[PDB]
Design a binder for this molecule. Structure first.
Ligand code: CHL
Ligand code: CLA
Ligand code: CLA
Ligand code: CLA
Ligand code: CLA
Ligand code: CLA
Ligand code: CLA
Ligand code: SQD
Ligand code: LUT
Ligand code: LUT
Ligand code: BCR
Lengths: 498, 93, 154, 144, 215, 297
């Protein structure tokens, strides 16, 4: 009866709108108020997941429907299931930790924390939206906060990166809007935008293919798909590391979530048509990004291309029409949200001390900064698909989903299985080299770098608190999969003969 | 009960013990809940803690502000300030 | 880093993939690598003394804040073990978060909390600024040192 | 050919009349499960092994873990259903009626166990699983 | 500054067995586990004090080995990795030889080394077992605390991690505890008619009963 | 009889608390942890001694018996997939566990005095104990997934220990070279495991061997795929045992400290390839050309 999801969506942006009533200077009160709001919201989502979400239910849960515009038949409609609660919890966790890690920011702290809370609200509103136009609105609601965060707290090339990001996202999202208009106006009697009634809609093959292309262009601009990935390297490389958490851990997974929710669920026939061509694209994306990563002298650009490489396993699990492949895609979503954010955070904190960019001049950092060396090595191992971490089990489950797939027969099933395997040969080749060019060797450092130079309690806590779920999922993957084994099956139930 | 013995000719016999065990969804929710409260506690405690580098003079004295581009802007600013100081010195003299 | 003088440009190229440390022929083995640089000493301090020193160096919360920050996690673990209702746990966690954040807002401000322009003024003027900001109300401070935050004025 | 064009094939009907009389198929069957093609000997070995795996499910039966009981039951039930179909289809004609009767009793026990799990009734689940247990022990004794 | 390999005597205000009392004049804290406990004055003579210190050390080590060899196999039997262990009945079991000939062989073998130890106590340094390598210098060991390659292959003594006095008092205290433990086990095996861990189990449950006063 | 095997999960997981506590301390309480240097080493030695005593009792039981004991549990329960984890105690496992424990306790005792004046003492012993845990998990593994998990974990420990002195540039190159050379073998081993799962449908050794023998003897599978999977499986053994053509990592693996050279590249890690080939020998026997390839290599 109580509007839980509406309260969860509204609370961060509504609380951040009141951050301008504070007449205090500095950043202390602003950052403590922002972390209070973030932790209260996190506890609210924890209560919702604990007491009102049932992982055994394949249906929509905690639905809320309020008619907002009559002409479009447009409703503020919210609802969660096994697909959305994982991204919602990840969004809350990563956004709270990014607010905590953005504490040295003393320039325009009020606007920074307001934009962080706005990003919180927009991501949560996207992940819990059951209306197509509401989905599009929540998709669009992050162009301005990320643009401002990039252009006001980014790197050397922040302005060009922000312009490229906003223009690329608008270019994808106009195709998203065209797909929304096409799907929502297909009704013979009246327009409809609810996903529940749209999941039973029947389209001709050509119109379904056109709608799939219209949605897929947007979901390939957002989730990096070759060759619509060029915004990502300069956007993530020249962004603040706290913003890089949201960019590489949350915003990248939104394209995959839209692919499951819309392309995979609403339009199954066009998805079955397009998936074998998506498999080759994902494998070539893995190889292409894992080969582009050694060519990048910049550390953050290398990490961004690593993120592009890791998105290929999600693409494969999407295109492999099995329950196991979709479960592996969700597991890789969670694993990458836990790995890329921490890697970007460590890179930013290390740059705040070393103040160097290109890898060929950052030797010997392990001598003054051993703890950040340890965390960087551990998160590289997590990136390396090492067992005991979530990445290995995610890639293994994706491999199993391909092997167990019934759509493909033998030879492609070989040539793709070999394919990503080449990727996990290329993934060490730069990553360890990165460490070898960033921590190994001897350099004579200043005496002032002997003390008060390593990561403090806050950075250690952030890295540990993102590292622990990685180990917890790599040991017991069903800490995540059990939330979405049922709903994924329902998503697969439309892909078989009926 | 949950124990199977297989005999193979020319091979040592095998005794297999099996236990199909899985965590309940309540236990998983408890793990998630405890990790959320641990995250909140750590955020509070380690935000209340002192930061050895970001509160130091080595960071704030150089012009740091938590912003990722302060180094390049500070460099261009000190070159422009040197040129302006030369202009001031030539104006005074 | 930052250079007040334009640095000499690199005339000779360097390999990108090479290790950035010193040359192996210039490496002082046993010293540069900490392999023969730990000689023991009878003067080793207490283990628990080291634990207390490391904990106190982090500047822990003290008093009621220290009490709640110490007693939060064992209370949550005991409540989850004793099968007490979880709504009470959520109420306690929210109350702890709000109380902790309010107490932290009540704590005085330090020089590192402000802008680099405020940090890099005259040290005596900065000390007077910090002393006033923690003493008078925020409205009096804003009506007295407001123009110091117009960074285009100077 | 590289990939299938239409929708993926569903539950292939058994040709040994081991399904339900009214429907022609069993409720615990799950579509999309990859069954490896080994042959009659491999199907018999997998049948015995998976009967042992389902007899390893005493621990999973509880008030909190009935969904995992249902999931494991559906998975292994599809596996042993199609393995039983394979071994009956390649059995001698004299041995087909008893094998079909044993399979029918085992799958009726599977349906009763799934029905008990659905109502979240634990004593009913235990009794139905005990009947399933004696049937599975009979299955491994037959197929050793 | 470095590693001191000499025992440091305890200060005269060290904790005592009976606080508020005057420690005896022959117990100045130079021995391990020195708590000033000598009501009968048995350590008045320094030579007999040295002999009694060596005897206490020997009894300590034998008692610790004894209690370990009682408890760990008993803890394994209760777990289930030992079929029929019983330390009381262990002496009357059937082995490859009679107890008498085994006792004679043990007497000869042990009276070799106990007698080499006697010669070392009477004449320190008369018997040396640590090798005299060409340029390695062998430090002079204390009587009753030998050990180079064989007895101290860890180099945990001679001032390494804990000072020699600290580790020696630790050894002596664990030894006294083990002597008391072994005498308790010997009396319990004939009083309760049961094993040690079983007696502990029936004492932990309802400790008001199942005691010395209920057999 | 059956009691000892039940409590054998303790064999890989007994050294683990020392690396866990050392890592947590050295990341959070460095001075307090470093105050207990030789104490940590002796704790590792005592835990490995307990593991060695258990393994000796297991070996003595295995010599005078005609039974192999396997324990399994359901790691993952999904609608489409299900994974298992457990331990198998066959004579090869007992032999390997005896070899590992007996060499490793002496290596720990040696490392106490080898790194007497080093500052990375605690990190060194944490790395060694974590390798011991990984290798003991590898030799007692019951399915191919667990084998691959502890295979890659052992490779990770070797990478960490070879480049122990990270300030040395030669070790800096050598650790990465060793990890990549072993990762080629890991890629081959994973491909072989996936192919074996596709052909058979199982990861357990006995069931996979019986299924493969039935398939080969009745000509129900093409021989080229079987030979390819066997060669891919043997590639991992070639890489980890440092054989042709993936032998290049072994000479550079000696840029690490000598006890690591002994324990890792002399007795245990280089024996992982031999252990894997001997474990998969009933599979390789029926496959036509793979035994000649193994002998030629
Ligand atoms: C040195 C200490 C020592 C002690 C304290 C004991 C103590 C004991 N023994 Mg043992 N024994 C010892 C050495 C030896 N015993 C034996 C051989 C035996 C036998 C043959 C028997 C004992 C028995 C006993 C019990 C006597 C009542 C008692 C528990 C008796 C028993 O059955 O109780 C456990 C018994 O019959 N002991 C030999 C070989 C000669 C020993 C050589 O050192
Ligand atoms: C050294 C420590 C020690 C310990 C922990 C135990 C432990 C146990 N004894 Mg044993 N016992 C000991 C020495 C010890 N004993 C000695 C020295 C003797 C006689 C010379 C006995 C003779 C004995 C008898 C006759 C009986 C037990 C029994 C028991 C139980 C206690 C109940 C009781 O009635 O006995 C108390 C008996 C005494 C004679 C007291 C002796 C205490 C000595 C002098 C000092 C120990 C104190 C010191 C503070 C120890 C530290 C405690 C802890 C930190 C280890 C318990 C399992 C009982 C049993 O299990 O019945 C079911 C029982 O019947 N014990
Ligand atoms: C070796 C045997 C030994 C003996 C017989 C004693 C004897 C005594 N100790 Mg001492 N003590 C010893 C060793 C010993 N201690 C050691 C090794 C230490 C460590 C330094 C101490 C430190 C010590 C302290 C701190 C205290 C005593 C106390 C006592 C007395 C109280 C016991 C009692 O009345 O309850 C009978 C107990 C039964 C369980 C029956 C008792 C006279 C107390 C004291 O002297 O005043 C009361 C006390 O407070 N002792
Ligand atoms: C094995 C025999 C043994 C021996 C030889 C010694 C010897 C010594 N003790 Mg140690 N001690 C022992 C066991 C022994 N102890 C035990 C079991 C305890 C715990 C109760 C202690 C606790 C202790 C303390 C607290 C202190 C010493 C100290 C001393 C030193 C001076 C006292 C003396 O002159 O001893 C001469 C001793 C003997 C010749 C033994 C005579 C015993 C008579 C003849 C009979 C035995 C009594 C009876 C059977 C006990 C049964 C057990 C009981 C629970 C019922 C000397 C090195 C002092 C020190 O400075 O440390 C170095 C001191 O402060 N001891
Ligand atoms: C203090 C000296 C000590 C002494 C005298 C004994 C004496 C004995 N032990 Mg014990 N034991 C000890 C310490 C000691 N143990 C230790 C430290 C341990 C390790 C926890 C054990 C573990 C142990 C086991 C596992 C067994 C014995 C058994 C035996 C008996 C005969 C076996 C043997 O000695 O020859 C063997 C000689 C070799 C060198 C080989 C004998 C009563 C045996 C038994 O209980 O008899 C049925 C037996 O099964 N002991
Ligand atoms: C119970 C504790 C104990 C303690 C604290 C001491 C303390 C002391 N002893 Mg004594 N000692 C003991 C029991 C003990 N001893 C026993 C039972 C004996 C008879 C065998 C001796 C006989 C003895 C000799 C002959 C020598 C010492 C020496 C020393 C010093 C070495 C440090 C030490 O031992 O490590 C402290 C830590 C431990 C005792 C931990 C317990 C060991 C566990 C239970 C087992 C060991 C693990 C594993 C099985 C061994 C490696 C396997 C390998 C063989 C393959 C120190 C002053 C040396 C000396 O004083 O020279 C200066 C000397 O060489 N001791
Ligand atoms: C009541 C408080 C108390 C306190 C504060 C201590 C304090 C101490 N004990 Mg004692 N001890 C006590 C009761 C106590 N003990 C009791 C009831 C017993 C059983 C009789 C012992 C038996 C004991 C042993 C066996 C040992 C200590 C040891 C130690 C010291 C090492 C600290 C560690 O770390 C420390 C000074 C160690 C020591 O220094 O001796 C070698 C040691 O190994 N204690
Ligand atoms: C995935 C695994 C990634 C591992 C990265 C290791 C990085 C490294 O060497 O950091 C070395 C630095 C510095 O070591 C500290 O500082 C010194 C480094 S040195 O010895 O001078 O090289 C030294 O005192 C000692 O190592 C320690 O105190 O480590 C730290 O600052 C904390 C390390 C905490 C964990 C140590 C034990 C790890 C055991 C294995 C855990 C599982 C794997
Ligand atoms: C009073 C007084 C007085 C003065 O003034 C001072 C003083 C002297 C200090 C005081 C005190 C005293 C005392 C109390 C003492 C005590 C002692 C003891 C108890 C000992 C034991 C001691 C003890 C000991 C050695 C022990 C030993 C043992 C042994 C070998 C054993 C063996 C065995 C075993 C294992 C097991 C098996 O199955 C059997 C057998 C084979 C049998
Ligand atoms: C009686 C009773 C009764 C009831 O019924 C129950 C109860 C209660 C349980 C009981 C009680 C008990 C007790 C208390 C006991 C105690 C014990 C001890 C102390 C032991 C030790 C014990 C101890 C021990 C073994 C020890 C040992 C040791 C050793 C070998 C050493 C070695 C070494 C050395 C020298 C040196 C080098 O460099 C090193 C090494 C090589 C390392
Ligand atoms: C999905 C999700 C989640 C969940 C998660 C989980 C469920 C977790 C669990 C977890 C667990 C259940 C865990 C367990 C255990 C663990 C452990 C046991 C660990 C250990 C560790 C150590 C001891 C150390 C470590 C380290 C560090 C920290 C870093 C450096 C390196 C090293 C490795 C040293 C959350 C809520 C976040 C939110 C979002 C979504």
């Amino acid at each position: 009866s109580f509007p839980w999801l509406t309260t969860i969506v509204v609370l961060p942006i509504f609380a951040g709108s009141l951050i301008f009533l504070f007449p205090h200077r500095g950043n202390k009160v602003i950052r403590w108020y922002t972390i209070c709001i973030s932790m209260i919201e996190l506890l609210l989502m924890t209560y919702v997941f604990f007491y009102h979400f049932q992982p055994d239910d394949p249906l929509i849960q905690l639905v809320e429907d309020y008619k907002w515009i009559n002409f479009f038949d447009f409703h503020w409609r919210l609802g969660i299931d096994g697909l959305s609660i994982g991204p919602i919890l990840l969004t809350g966790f990563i956004t709270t930790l990014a607010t905590l890690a953005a504490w040295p920011v003393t320039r325009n702290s009020q606007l920074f924390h307001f934009l962080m809370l706005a990003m919180y609200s927009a991501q949560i509103g996207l992940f819990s939206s059951r209306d197509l136009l509401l989905f599009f609105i929540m998709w669009e609601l992050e162009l301005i906060p990320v643009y401002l965060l990039l252009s006001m707290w980014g790197g050397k090339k922040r302005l060009y990166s922000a312009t490229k990001f906003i223009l690329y996202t608008a270019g994808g999202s106009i195709f998203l809007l065209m797909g929304v208009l096409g799907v929502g106006l297909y009704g013979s009697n009246e327009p409809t935008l609810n996903l529940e009634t749209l999941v039973n809609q029947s389209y001709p093959v050509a119109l379904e293919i056109i709608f799939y292309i219209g949605f897929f262009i947007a979901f390939a601009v957002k989730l990096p798909i070759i060759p619509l990935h060029t915004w990502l390297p300069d956007t993530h490389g020249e962004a603040h590391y706290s913003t890089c958490m949201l960019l590489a851990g949350i915003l990248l997974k939104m394209g995959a979530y839209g692919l499951v929710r819309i392309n995979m669920e609403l339009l199954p026939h066009a998805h079955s048509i397009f998936s074998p061509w998506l498999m080759i694209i994902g494998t070539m994306q893995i190889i292409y990004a894992a080969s582009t990563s050694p060519g990048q002298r910049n550390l953050k650009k290398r990490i961004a291309y690593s993120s592009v490489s890791h998105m290929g396993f999600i693409i494969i699990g999407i295109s492999s029409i099995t329950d196991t492949g979709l479960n592996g895609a969700i597991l890789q979503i969670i694993s990458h949200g836990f790995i890329g954010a921490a890697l970007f955070f460590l890179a930013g904190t290390s740059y705040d001390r070393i103040r160097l960019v290109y890898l060929d001049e950052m030797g010997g950092i392990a001598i003054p900064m051993p703890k950040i060396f340890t965390l960087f090595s551990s998160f590289s191992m997590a990136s390396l698909a090492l067992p005991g971490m979530s990445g290995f089990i995610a890639e293994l489950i994706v491999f199993f989903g391909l092997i167990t797939s019934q759509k493909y027969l033998l030879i492609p099933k070989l040539l793709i299985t070999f394919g990503m395997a080449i990727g996990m040969i290329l993934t060490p080749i730069y990553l360890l080299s990165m460490s070898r060019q960033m921590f190994y060797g001897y350099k004579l450092f200043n005496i002032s770098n002997s003390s008060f130079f390593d990561s403090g309690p806050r950075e250690l806590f952030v890295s540990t608190s993102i590292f622990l779920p990685v180990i917890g999922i790599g040991v017991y993957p069903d800490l995540v999969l059990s939330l979405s084994v049922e709903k994924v099956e329902a998503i697969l139930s439309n892909y078989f003969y009926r | 009960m949950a124990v199977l013995v297989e005999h193979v000719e020319g091979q040592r016999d095998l005794i297999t013990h099996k236990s199909i065990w899985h965590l309940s969804d309540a236990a998983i929710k408890n793990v998630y809940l405890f990790y959320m409260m641990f995250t909140c506690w750590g955020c509070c405690v380690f935000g209340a803690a002192k930061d050895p580098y970001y509160d130091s003079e080595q960071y704030r004295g150089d012009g740091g502000d938590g912003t990722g581009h302060w180094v390049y802007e500070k460099q261009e600013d000190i070159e422009e300030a040197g040129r302006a100081a030369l202009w001031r010195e030539e104006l005074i003299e | 880093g930052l250079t007040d003088i334009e640095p000499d440009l690199n005339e000779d190229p360097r390999d990108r993939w090479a290790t950035n440390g010193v040359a192996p022929e210039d490496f002082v083995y046993g010293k540069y690598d900490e392999h023969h640089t730990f000689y023991e000493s009878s003067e080793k301090g207490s283990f628990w003394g080291a634990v207390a020193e490391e904990y106190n160096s982090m500047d822990p919360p003290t008093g009621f804040q220290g009490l709640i920050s110490w007693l939060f996690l064992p209370a949550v673990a005991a409540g989850m073990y004793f099968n007490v209702p979880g709504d009470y746990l959520f109420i306690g966690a929210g109350l702890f978060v709000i109380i902790f954040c309010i107490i932290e807002m009540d704590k005085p401000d330090q020089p590192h909390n402000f802008e680099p322009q405020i940090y890099n003024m005259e040290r005596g003027a900065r000390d007077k600024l910090i002393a006033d900001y923690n003493t008078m109300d925020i409205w009096d401070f804003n009506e007295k040192y407001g123009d110091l935050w117009d960074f285009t004025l100077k | 050919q590289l990939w299938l064009d239409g929708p993926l094939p569903g539950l292939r009907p058994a040709e040994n009349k081991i399904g339900n009389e009214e429907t022609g198929t069993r409720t615990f069957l799950k579509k999309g499960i990859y069954m490896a093609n080994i042959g009659t000997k491999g199907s018999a070995l997998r049948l015995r092994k998976y009967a042992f795996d389902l007899l390893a499910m005493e621990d999973l039966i509880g008030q909190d873990t009935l969904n995992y009981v249902r999931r494991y039951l559906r998975f292994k039930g599809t596996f042993m259903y199609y393995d039983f179909d394979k071994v009956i289809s390649a059995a001698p004609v004299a041995d087909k009626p008893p094998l079909t009767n044993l399979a029918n009793r085992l799958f009726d026990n599977f349906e009763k166990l799934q029905e008990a799990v659905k109502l979240k009734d634990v004593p009913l689940t235990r009794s139905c699983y005990d009947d399933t247990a004696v049937t599975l022990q009979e299955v491994m004794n037959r197929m050793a | 500054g470095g590693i001191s390999s000499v025992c440091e005597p305890l200060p005269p205000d060290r904790p005592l067995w009976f606080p508020g009392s005057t420690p005896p004049q022959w117990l100045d804290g130079s021995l391990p586990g020195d708590f000033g406990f000598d009501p009968l004055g048995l350590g008045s003579d320094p030579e007999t004090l040295r002999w009694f210190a060596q005897a206490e050390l020997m009894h300590s080590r034998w008692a610790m080995l004894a209690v370990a060899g009682i408890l760990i196999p008993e803890w394994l039997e209760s777990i289930g990795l030992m079929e029929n262990f019983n330390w009381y009945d262990a002496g009357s079991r059937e082995y490859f030889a009679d107890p008498t000939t085994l006792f004679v062989v043990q007497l000869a073998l042990m009276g070799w080394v106990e007698g080499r130890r006697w010669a070392d106590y009477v004449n320190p340094g008369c018997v040396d077992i640590e090798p005299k390598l060409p340029n390695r210098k062998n430090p002079k060991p204390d009587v009753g605390y030998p050990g180079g390659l064989w007895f101290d292959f860890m180099m945990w003594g001679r001032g390494s991690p804990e000072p020699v006095m600290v580790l020696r008092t630790k050894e002596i205290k664990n030894g006294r505890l083990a002597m008391l433990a072994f005498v308790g086990l010997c009396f319990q095996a004939v009083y309760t008619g049961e094993g040690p861990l079983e007696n502990l189990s029936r004492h932990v449950a309802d400790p008001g009963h199942c005691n010395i006063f209920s057999a | 009889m059956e009691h000892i095997y039940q409590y054998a999960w303790i064999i890989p997981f007994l050294p683990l608390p020392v690396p866990l506590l050392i890592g947590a301390g050295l990341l959070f309480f460095p001075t307090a942890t470093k105050n207990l240097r030789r104490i940590w080493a002796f704790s590792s030695i005592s835990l490995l001694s307990i593991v060695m005593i258990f393994s000796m009792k297991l070996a003595i039981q295995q010599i005078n018996s005609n039974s192999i004991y396997q324990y399994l549990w359901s790691w993952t329960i999904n609608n489409d997939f299900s994974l298992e984890f457990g331990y198998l105690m066959d004579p090869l496992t007992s032999i390997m566990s005896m070899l590992i424990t007996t060499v490793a306790i002496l290596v720990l005792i040696y490392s106490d005095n080898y790194m007497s004046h080093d500052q990375g003492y605690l990190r060194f012993f944490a790395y060694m104990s974590f390798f011991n845990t990984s290798m003991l998990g590898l030799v007692t593994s019951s399915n191919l997934i667990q084998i691959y998990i502890f295979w890659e974990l052992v490779g990770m420990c070797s990478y960490l220990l070879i480049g122990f002195w990270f300030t040395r540039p030669i070790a800096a190159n050598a650790c990465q070279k060793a990890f990549v050379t072993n990762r080629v073998g890991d890629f081959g081993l994973l491909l072989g495991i996936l192919g074996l799962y596709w052909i058979t449908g199982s990861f357990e050794f006995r069931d996979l061997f019986e299924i493969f023998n039935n398939l080969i003897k009745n000509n129900e599978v093409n021989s080229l795929f079987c030979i390819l999977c066997a060669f891919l499986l043997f590639a991992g053994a070639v890489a980890k045992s440092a054989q042709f053509p993936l032998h290049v990592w072994l000479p550079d693996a000696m840029e690490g400290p000598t006890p690591i050279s002994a324990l890792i590249h002399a007795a245990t890690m280089v024996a992982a390839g031999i252990f894997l080939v001997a474990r998969l020998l009933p599979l390789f026997v029926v496959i036509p050309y793979i035994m000649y390839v193994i002998s030629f290599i």
